[PDB]
């Protein structure tokens, strides 16, 4: 039977092999929604070639590439198997992967969805918490695609544009935290500090009204509420690059600071990610948990397992799509409000693209 | 009958009359927990005398002084009346007001509680969301009082040090938002943007790991959950002072930004305050809603009523104390973890003061 409903899973993506690193970095630094550097179409290629060896070396240290596509695929397969049973009037369902910076690109996925002749298309961001830098840029690419080709879509579009507090997402995080708490020495379990580590944002993005920090904070609160506040916690921020101000405190300085103040039993939680990638496998697990932690005299530092192949996460994705379909929603209420200090004209056009869709 | 249980309600306070402004500013700029300044003991009286006319004029604009003491007293009386019936084994209950920067000062309240011979003393911060600059500095003052006086307490101490998601606090905000939504023209109700406006913090405090922004975000999420996401919202930050970086976006810039982008129907919500004071009556209601809003061409800008005399809020306070008593908690789990980049040694001493209390 031909596919009736397409679920486009949106992520920035990462290079699968060392050979993919250069083009990954090229697309990243060309992303005007992320950064407006001068002589962009010529300054970004210089940055890409200069940083490729360093970034190749990071991926070599975690096994040669990013696992994002593998995990996204497994999660999508499970989502589809459930949806075909959950929602037979919109079946058969097909998942598509739309990466921002590597193949398959969002634009290639849209071409395939259209070639498949879908009736309905769901832009399903894989970022639970919305940032203009993540979900916003992915959604812009969908709007831009139809604007560049100059023709209108042959499928009815809608988006699941955020889901920071979905009860099954929360249950997954709480399950992985408890599982990891069990791996500390029993005499130190109560002593463990839970560091929720989310990707940071430049302060210039925070200060123009990006909803990401507040939504990440809501995920943290719902998790800790499900855990009945069993351990103390803090929300800290990782992966800052460059010389500009970013939202802190930084994860690495917070680890170092806890250690120097007698808190040497630490549980890291990647609260803004749904699978492993360079920011967990390299930044948290190598740079912080092995190098920094040893330098500071950590007793035990562990990290909750990424959601990856947990079947409850696939259930969460299918439940989100099912509710989205039954409610006839085109987007969240939050998407109808663009950032108060937004300077990009595309954001309003992308918003209107989804709110005006024929049902 | 002799009072048995004292509830010390902690707030920064504000000057009741124009004559109180100078000493209010003096204590404010002498507070090393709130800000560090060179030669503070001679610099602060310079700043205090310089700023007194300006600040007296702000208070003149809202009727001659701060209403905080009035509202705190009404809230405390209602709390006590309920507690005497909720918890007769700890009755009679008596509330005490402990202001940081005006009379009655935290130190004066502690003296009175001790003189009254209470069996039990509860440090009940009136900030639902914890910052080291608000609740932390108030709790430090309790520890420092016993440290300076050289004696030990004659009453058993505990603290309710935060409550950002208490279900009755959330209901009060939701009720006031709905009531104010009804005062917009019906044809614009759906169009209203809800700006949750919380007092900002300097980035130097945020980057230390202060828990405030995450907890404020959690209050916002629970309110909007109760409101069923009926309107788009943003969390923005007010009351920045000085030239250093603070957490944004600023409330004033956000109002102006919305107006220039076509969102001319705005509901302000003071999400980190429990009553009116200068930041609502002057900054929000005069500086932003009358002057700024008129210059930008707002159609309707309103503000949810502060919780003030709402009897449901008094029920929330009594429910908090009652549950605190039943559970034998000395403090939240979160208080047992100091800021990872905290450089102030009193914070740990204060923490230990409460965790170590005889039950
Ligand atoms: C306005 C452009 C300035 C820039 N904004 C940026 N954001 C990021 C990473 N964003 C991110 C957030 C959450 C998650 Cl889950 C993953 C990724 N990198 N970056 C830059 O290099 C320049
Ligand atoms: C002219 C005064 C200089 C300063 N004023 C400051 N205010 C604060 C945060 N206060 C705060 C109040 C209420 C709430 Cl709900 C939350 C937070 N920090 N701070 C400084 O460091 C210096
Ligand atoms: S920047 Fe957030 S909407 Fe354009
Ligand atoms: S600064 Fe937060 S504990 Fe001292």
UniProtKB/Swiss-Prot annotation, chains A, B:
GO terms for cellular component: mitochondrial inner membrane; mitochondrial matrix; mitochondrion. Its cofactor is [2Fe-2S] cluster. Its EC number is 4.98.1.1. GO terms for molecular function: 2 iron, 2 sulfur cluster binding; ferrochelatase activity; ferrous iron binding; heme binding; identical protein binding; iron-responsive element binding; protein homodimerization activity. Pathway: Porphyrin-containing compound metabolism; protoheme biosynthesis; protoheme from protoporphyrin-IX: step 1/1. Changing residue 296 to S: No loss of activity. Changing residue 132 to S: Loss of activity. This is Ferrochelatase, mitochondrial. It comes from Homo sapiens. The gene is FECH. The chain holds residues 65 to 423 of 423 of the full protein.
């Amino acid at each position: 039977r031909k596919p009736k409903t397409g679920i486009l899973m949106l992520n920035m993506g990462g290079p699968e092999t060392l050979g993919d690193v250069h083009d990954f970095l090229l697309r990243l630094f060309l992303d005007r929604d992320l950064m407006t550097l001068p002589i962009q179409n010529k300054l970004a290629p210089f940055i890409a070639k200069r940083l490729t060896p360093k970034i190749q070396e990071q991926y070599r240290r975690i096994g040669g590439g990013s696992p994002i596509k593998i995990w996204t695929s497994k999660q999508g397969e499970g989502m589809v198997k459930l949806l075909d049973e959950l929602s037979p009037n919109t079946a058969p369902h097909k998942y598509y992967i739309g990466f921002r910076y590597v193949h398959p690109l969002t634009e290639e996925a849209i071409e395939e969805m259209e070639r498949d002749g879908l009736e309905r298309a769901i832009a399903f961001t894989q970022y639970p918490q919305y940032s203009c830098s993540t979900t916003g840029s992915s959604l812009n690419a969908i709007y831009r695609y139809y604007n560049q080709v100059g023709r209108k879509p042959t499928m009815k579009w809608s988006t699941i544009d955020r889901w920071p507090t979905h009860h099954l997402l929360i249950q997954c995080f709480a399950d992985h935290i408890l599982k990891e708490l069990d791996h500390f020495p029993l005499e130190k379990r109560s002593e463990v500090v839970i560091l929720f580590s989310a990707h940071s944002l430049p302060m210039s993005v925070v200060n123009r009204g990006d909803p990401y920090p507040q939504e990440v904070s809501a995920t943290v609160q719902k998790v800790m509420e499900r855990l009945e506040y069993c351990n103390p916690y803090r929300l800290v921020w990782q992966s800052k690059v460059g010389p500009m101000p970013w939202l802190g405190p930084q994860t690495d300085e917070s680890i170092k600071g806890l250690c120097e103040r007698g808190r040497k039993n630490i549980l890291l939680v990647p609260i803004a990610f749904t699978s492993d990638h360079i920011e967990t496998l390299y930044e948290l697990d190598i740079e912080y948990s092995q190098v920094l932690a040893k330098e500071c005299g950590v007793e035990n530092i562990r990290r909750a397992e990424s959601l990856n192949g947990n079947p409850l996460f696939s259930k969460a994705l299918a439940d989100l799509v099912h509710s989205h379909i039954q409610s006839n929603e085109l987007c969240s209420k939050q998407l109808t409000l663009s950032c108060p200090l937004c300077v990009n004209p595309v954001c309003r056009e992308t918003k209107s693209f989804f709110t005006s869709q024929q049902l």
